[PDB]
């Protein structure tokens, strides 16, 4: 009585969750855009009416691919660069004590060593200023990396400044974007659109603080895979940025040492003037009221009369226990103990100064046996950044006590990438469909 | 009421419209299915996209639906698939929900369209032999 027959429709708007390889788009630098397609001057966003889509930022394969891409770009930017195998020699080091403050004592070593020249049968006695964090005593020292691997000097012309990178789906795939503000990254997004490329995401490498990122448009956003599991990192996104001013004030002198035919090692010559500590400044009132916002949003998950406490990082590597970042070629590791030091009970112009230590021997990603040497930067260096979020870790939390304690976390850059890709997902279009219709062929 | 004609909702703009309404925008989805280590992953992606497009085209063509976007067939609608007579499919549901409802019923239909098309080719062969 129905008299219904199979009918094939091609071009149907249906999609499935898919994993594919996205490609790069962008408008000397590590984040190589010489292999990235030009971005469209007028990108097209298609706002999908009535589409309620399932999103999950914690299983997003875009994050994994982007992590791989960033690591590969870092690796290939270091390949045509000087391998500092000759630098693994015995160093004769003394203390730098000419115009140092009390907090820079023992932090710099004046190390003389024998080095190869362009002629295979000649040696040169040279010297360099090294950081206490980069040398280990055997008055005789060696570079920290020399019992693990040889180090590759970063090519001085290559810039470390992040450039925005757009991620685009290939043919047959679409990037679905969640336009829902107040979205916490997991569950159904009822306001969905389609984009051919993601927005410009800067590969900002940092720990304990997300810098130069995107802000929430409504209020501070708390995002955890499982908020009641204290082994899961909490990602905090600010609605208003916090300005952080980081300086290395030393007037550094770079000298170039010919260690082989066409091979230069860039040593630190001598600091012109006073030697004093690198640091970062954060506005005290801005940070205080931002933490008030974070506390008000954490109470929604951890009780309305609970005590919310911020404390120091527990321990581990210097990368994870400090706000570690990169300020114009130099690698800072700042003690964020004045930031996360407070308790919150339910009921001017000064600033917080975070002392920072510089390093030249860098292990960027959580890898061992693959290290990078940062050449010294000529002159004083100063940068200004926006803190747009936090990576926190909740402490213990048994039912014994009513105080919740949060400590800065980080180390894994996938959480940094997840804070920008939380509202994106990749799907593959399924154009073929079969339906009942009255026609017969 | 009064109208001023058809509009353009974009690449997947009809994904939330009814199946009848979304059946009017098939070409829109159709056209955007085709377009030293990152010259390799890119090339693998392009080869894959071409391969899936060609698999879909071959699957259409071995059903007698070659060159068509809507293709009514000779295979009847076995009601063990779906019991919704028509008013609650084309005017009250979207293609995503329908695919949710028949992803468990797909491959058998594809094989049936295949064998029916081969039957048709042979019957046409016999007809033209007279």
């Amino acid at each position: 009585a129905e008299n219904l027959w199979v009918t094939v429709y091609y071009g149907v708007p249906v999609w499935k969750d898919a994993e594919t390889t996205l490609f790069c788009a962008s408008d000397h630098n590590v984040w190589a855009t010489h292999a990235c397609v030009p971005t469209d001057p007028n990108p097209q966003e298609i706002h999908l009416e009535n589409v309620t889509e399932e999103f999950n930022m914690w299983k997003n394969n875009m994050v994994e691919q982007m992590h791989t891409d960033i690591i590969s770009l870092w690796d290939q930017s270091l390949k045509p660069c000087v391998k500092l195998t000759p630098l693994c020699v015995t160093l004769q080091c003394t203390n730098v004590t000419n115009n140092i403050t009390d907090d820079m004592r023992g932090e710099l070593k004046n190390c003389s060593f024998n080095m190869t020249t362009e002629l295979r049968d000649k040696k040169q006695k040279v010297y360099s200023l090294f950081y206490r964090l980069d040398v280990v005593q055997i008055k005789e020292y060696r570079l920290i990396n020399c019992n693990t691997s040889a180090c590759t000097q970063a090519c001085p012309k290559v810039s470390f400044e992040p450039i925005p990178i757009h991620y685009c789906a290939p043919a047959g795939f679409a990037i679905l974007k969640c336009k829902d503000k107040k979205f916490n990254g997991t569950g159904p997004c009822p306001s969905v659109s389609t984009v051919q490329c993601t927005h410009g995401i800067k590969p900002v490498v940092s720990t304990q603080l997300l810098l130069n990122g995107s802000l929430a448009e409504e209020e501070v956003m708390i995002r955890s895979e499982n908020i009641t599991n204290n082994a899961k990192n909490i990602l905090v996104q600010f609605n208003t940025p916090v300005q952080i001013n980081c300086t290395r004030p030393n007037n550094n002198t770079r000298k170039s040492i010919r260690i082989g035919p066409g091979q230069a090692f860039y040593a630190t010559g001598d600091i012109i003037g006073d030697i004093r500590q690198a640091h970062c400044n954060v506005s005290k009132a801005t940070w205080n009221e931002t933490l008030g916002k974070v506390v008000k949003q954490l109470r929604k998950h951890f009780g309305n009369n609970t005590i919310i406490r911020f404390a120091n990082s527990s321990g581990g590597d210097l990368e994870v226990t400090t706000h570690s970042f990169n300020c114009g070629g130099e690698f800072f590791y700042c003690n964020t103990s004045g930031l996360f030091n407070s308790t919150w009970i339910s009921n001017s112009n000064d600033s917080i100064t975070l002392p920072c230590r510089i390093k030249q021997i860098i292990n960027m990603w959580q890898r061992i046996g693959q290290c990078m040497y940062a050449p010294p930067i000529q002159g004083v260096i100063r940068c200004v950044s926006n803190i747009t979020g936090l990576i926190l870790t909740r402490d213990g939390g048994s039912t014994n006590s009513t105080t919740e304690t949060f400590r800065p976390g980080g180390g894994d850059m996938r959480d940094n990438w997840r804070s920008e890709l939380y509202k994106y997902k990749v799907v593959k279009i399924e154009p073929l469909g079969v339906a009942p219709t009255r026609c017969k062929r | 009421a009064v109208g001023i004609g058809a509009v353009f909702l974009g690449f997947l703009g009809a994904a939330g419209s009814t199946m009848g309404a979304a059946s009017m925008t098939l070409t829109v989805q159709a056209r955007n299915l085709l377009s030293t280590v990152w010259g390799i992953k890119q090339l693998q992606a392009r080869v894959l996209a071409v391969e899936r497009y060609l698999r879909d085209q071959q699957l259409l063509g071995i059903w007698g639906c070659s060159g068509k976007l809507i293709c009514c067939t000779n295979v009847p609608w076995n009601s063990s698939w779906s019991n919704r007579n028509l008013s609650e499919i084309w005017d009250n549901m979207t293609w995503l929900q329908w695919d949710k409802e028949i992803s468990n019923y797909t491959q058998i239909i594809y094989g049936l369209l295949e064998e029916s098309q081969n039957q048709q080719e042979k019957n046409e062969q016999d007809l033209l032999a007279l």
Partner: antibody, heavy 122, light 107 residues
Framework: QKVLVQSGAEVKKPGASVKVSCRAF????????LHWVRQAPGQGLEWLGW????????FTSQKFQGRVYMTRDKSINTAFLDVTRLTSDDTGIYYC???????????????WGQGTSVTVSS | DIQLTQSPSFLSASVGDKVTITCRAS??????LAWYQQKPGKAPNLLIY???TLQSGVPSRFSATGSGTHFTLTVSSLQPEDFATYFC?????????FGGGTKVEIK
């Protein structure tokens, strides 16, 4: 998320021409027919016309025909209303309004612009 | 041009009362009527479309009824943000026209 933003206010002499712009955000520009309406101070609304942003077709209210022109640019998701030969009776607030446009026919103006004051006086 | 006429032109009522506002059309508009709310110095809001369908994001106290030439908009329990101007607008045939308007004010 659907917003229509119009250009700034205009003060013109009689017999001049005015150009009201209207840009769309939060929805596909070519997916809904766009109305133009005007309200005089303390009076009711007067519907001027509407345009199909996809094809470019227009319909003007017959008493405005040959004097007001509707155009759109898709590259910037914008619609332009040109009101020519202005007189003091043209003074009022000009609105661009997205239509719900179900079934390719007028259903209702659900998104409205913030309005553009156009004052005509010697 | 089709004429829409609304009753009252002006009305005073208190919070919690019911208001019924009547729009009459000179010609037939089957269900092609929309009810809009406008407040001082601001663009109107779509309340009703199809003469009986409530716009998404509108409180349920708003309701409309009628087909053809006679339509009534009812707010069952008034609220201090509902005191504003109201328009009825048909779109059956050109030109689309709006009603004269009803201004509801608190007593």
């Amino acid at each position: 998320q659907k917003v229509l933003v119009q250009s700034g206010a205009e003060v013109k002499k009689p017999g001049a021409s005015v150009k009201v712009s209207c840009r769309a955000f939060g929805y596909t520009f070519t997916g809904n027919a766009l109305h133009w309406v005007r309200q005089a101070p303390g009076q009711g609304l007067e519907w001027l016309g509407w345009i199909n942003p996809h094809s470019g077709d227009t319909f003007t209210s017959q008493k405005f025909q040959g004097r007001v022109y509707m155009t759109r640019d898709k590259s910037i998701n914008t619609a332009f209303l040109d009101v020519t030969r202005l007189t003091s009776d043209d003074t009022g607030i000009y609105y661009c309004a997205r239509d719900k446009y179900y079934g390719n026919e007028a259903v209702g103006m659900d998104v409205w612009g913030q309005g553009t004051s156009v004052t005509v006086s010697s | 041009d089709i004429q829409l006429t609304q009753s009252p032109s002006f009305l005073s009522a208190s919070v919690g009362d019911k208001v019924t506002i009547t729009c009459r059309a000179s010609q037939g508009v089957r269900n092609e009527l929309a009810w809009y709310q406008q407040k001082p110095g601001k663009a109107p809001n779509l309340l009703i479309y199809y003469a009986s369908t409530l716009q998404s994001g509108v409180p349920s106290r708003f309701s409309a009824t009628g087909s053809g030439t006679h339509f009534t908009l009812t707010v069952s329990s008034l609220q201090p943000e509902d005191f504003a101007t109201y328009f009825c607008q048909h779109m059956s045939s050109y030109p689309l026209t709006f009603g004269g308007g009803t201004k509801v004010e608190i007593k």
